[PDB]
Amino acid sequence: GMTEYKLVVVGACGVGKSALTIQLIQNHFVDEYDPTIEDSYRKQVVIDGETCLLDILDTAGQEEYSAMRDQYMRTGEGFLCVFAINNTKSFEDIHHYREQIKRVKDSEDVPMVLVGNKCDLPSRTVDTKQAQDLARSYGIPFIETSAKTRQGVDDAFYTLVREIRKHKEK
Ligand SMILES: Nc1nc2c(ncn2[C@@H]2O[C@H](COP(=O)(O)OP(=O)(O)O)[C@@H](O)[C@H]2O)c(=O)[nH]1
């Protein structure tokens, strides 16, 4: 089979995980999507000449059983860590997601991309500099996105694939 990349989108409720995923997969902005629905979505794409499958889990937070969270973190190859640029708590929550994924995977080297979503809004509490400082500290890319306008969306997901590739080559 062509290569499949198992991607996981994490972040506080309301940051735009579902909107980002639907924009990536379907090329539409869906502005209302039940915050409690967690599902996976698939898309066949070409990234840097490679035809591959993206298998993307749009997470929604607590699970019936914590074992289910641990399972998707172990299975997942790369993580989009999403905050919203107008929600400081969502940015602070990134520290927890970074930790928890590393902890479950028992790894110091987990492909991740920091994503600051809702960049179409002038209303902003997290400046680009602050997010760059966090991404620098993690040694990962940082991309500002808008699920609404599609700015940065392919970049976020494709950059995460490229980070998975760099991890694999070791
Ligand atoms: N302006 C704007 N609103 C967004 C964007 N992404 C999501 N939203 C809105 O933010 C809210 C939460 O989005 P949702 O995709 O449900 O977030 P999730 O809980 O992380 O899955 C909804 O009201 C969306 O319309 C974006 O890039 N720009």
Ligand SMILES: [Mg+2]
């Ligand atoms: Mg959602």
